[model samples]
Target: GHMGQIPLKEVTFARLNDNVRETFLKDMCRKYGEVEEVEILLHPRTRKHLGLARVLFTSTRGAKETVKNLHLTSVMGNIIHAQLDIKGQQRMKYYELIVNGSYTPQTVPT
Candidate 1:
């Protein structure tokens, strides 16, 4: 809830010959609210697409709503794993993170 961004894992758009345009993601996810930004990441060493990306919503509530609805939402036949990228460190199930507040993010360099 602190962060308004969600990380999408195992998105196949990179291999599907589509960079998964910002507009495409925006249009699809805007139902939550204003999409602040979108980004796709690549393997650091190999420079290959890692099927991961980040979507930032303008409001924390928008991101939380998005995680609730977007997880396992199919994209062109593939499901994208949507999880809260809390503190820019650990990744956990939305329920666990939001409800239980079970785990703490590891210490990361700023």
Candidate 2:
């Protein structure tokens, strides 16, 4: 979602590792505002860990600002990959860095 100064009601992130635990994400997501809900996306069939997450937040603009700086951000003991929640039924593209109108990510961990 391009922020043309128009804020989002909910935002999501789809590139997080499970190393960043549910509690960690809940707290981080809530750092901007009240966390209404948090959903962890799983895959590889039968709901195994796929390292993805979606967050429902109280402030869209507040989230938008922070998401940019999330990549490579430390969580638990490892670094993480976080990005704007790729919305409904949309497949995440390979190498999809900063969305058209978003923040510049820090270097991906080598």
Candidate 3:
């Protein structure tokens, strides 16, 4: 069904304090599905918050649920939004090529 393999990408939130980060993760995990991985990124030099994270789920259903439910909500005084990771755009393109029968496989003599 292509439901669970899709990756959640580019989740945005207001700069999170220590208190909110843990709660957000826990709430998200409980509300959606089992979380496989999570990464909160911050600016390197400025040491300021980047307000972004990537969450991976064990199934596509979970990702879909999170996308549908967790958007533009206040968490730790910051608004949060979640969406599919567009970083895999290229992979999707390749998949489309294969699906359309445009992708050619080179045959080796071996």
Candidate 4:
């Protein structure tokens, strides 16, 4: 079996509340394959505009399919746009750890 990497998808939506953001991420993960990672961007100063986010899936096929099916509409009283997460292009290491039960923060030296 050949494992292939897939290009991530990009999406934008209107600003949303924290609860709505969480719901949107959950829904996207459910609709797509095992969610690899999620990145949400907000306005730097005001932290208001939730204009964009990236939702990465574990499988390329799944990512592609999710992007193709994404629609901009209302969910839980907020307009949401679902798509793949593509940006600085870091490996989903944190997400992998979380999924594998290996994600735990070590106490820092004070």
- Could you say which candidate leads in lDDT? 2
Q: Residue 35 CA error for candidate 4 (Å)?
A: 0.3
- Between candidates 1 and 2, the one scoring higher on TM-score is 2
Local error of candidate 4 at residue 103 (angstroms): 38
Candidate 4 per-residue C-alpha lDDT over 27-99 given as tens digits, one digit per residue, 9 for 90 to 100: 7555756666666654445564233455656666766666566544555555544444445332233222323
Candidate 3 Cα lDDT to native? 0.50
Cα-based lDDT for every prediction:
0.50, 0.52, 0.50, 0.46
True-vs-predicted CA distance for residue 103, candidate 3, Å? 40
The list of candidate 2 runs beyond 4 A from truth reads 1-7, 89-110
Give the best candidate by TM-score: 2
Ordered list by TM-score, greatest first: 2, 3, 1, 4
Higher-lDDT candidate of 3 and 4: 3
TM-score of 1: 0.57
- Tens digits of lDDT, candidate 2, 1-110: 46634446445454455555578778786766677777665543455434555666677665665565565676654455555553532323312332321322223221
In the range 54-94, model 3's lDDT, one tens digit per residue, is 66677766766776777655666655555665554433333
TM-score, cand. 4: 0.50
